[PDB]
Design a protein around this ligand. Structure first.
Ligand code: O0G
Length: 171
């Protein structure tokens, strides 16, 4: 059976407890924690690409008021569909399964200024999603996994001082 497991799930849960925030900038900002997954049940002999995108969680935006995240108004129109290709792509099943797959280099941005960055709307909540794409497949088989522990609100600046502190503590 294909199994894609979240690495460092208890680290993600420490952030999710506070409501996780990721900074978006013009030139793009790397995530902490980094999304890392373990993989079993691929064909070790087959070739696959790993893709990452971010799914909008809500039909509204958020705002931080009196130390609480609350519904913050109607959403901005959906960010353009940005997909990040894991740089090891394409590679053998054996490659993806021998050690956790790390998306350490993906950058989150609030400006369409290229560089393979992911555009997100500030004060909107997103859920990372990984796609495994089989190479040379006439059926173009794709598998998609979502990671609920990794949900975060995109921000231009940290709202929760506990997130500011946690980001310093664990990074
Ligand atoms: C939070 C802590 C709980 O034992 N777990 C982790 N902490 C930090 C790193 Cl670098 C990775 C982890 F997996």
């Amino acid at each position: 059976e294909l199994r894609v497991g979240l690495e460092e799930s208890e680290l993600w849960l420490r952030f999710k407890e506070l409501t996780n925030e990721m900074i978006v900038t013009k030139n793009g900002r790397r995530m902490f924690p980094v999304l890392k997954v373990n993989v079993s049940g691929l064909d070790p002999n087959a070739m696959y690409s790993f893709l990452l995108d971010f799914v909008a969680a809500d039909n509204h935006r958020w705002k931080y008021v009196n130390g609480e995240w609350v519904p913050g108004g109607k959403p901005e129109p959906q960010a353009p569909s940005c997909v990040y290709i894991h740089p090891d792509s394409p590679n053998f099943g054996a490659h993806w399964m021998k050690a956790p797959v790390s998306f350490s280099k993906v950058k989150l941005t609030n400006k369409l200024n290229g560089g393979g960055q992911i555009m997100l709307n500030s004060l909107h909540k997103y859920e990372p999603r990984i796609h495994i794409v089989r190479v040379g497949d006439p059926q173009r088989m794709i598998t998609s996994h979502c990671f609920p522990e990794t949900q975060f609100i995109a921000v231009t600046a940290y709202q929760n001082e506990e997130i500011t502190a946690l980001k310093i503590k664990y990074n």
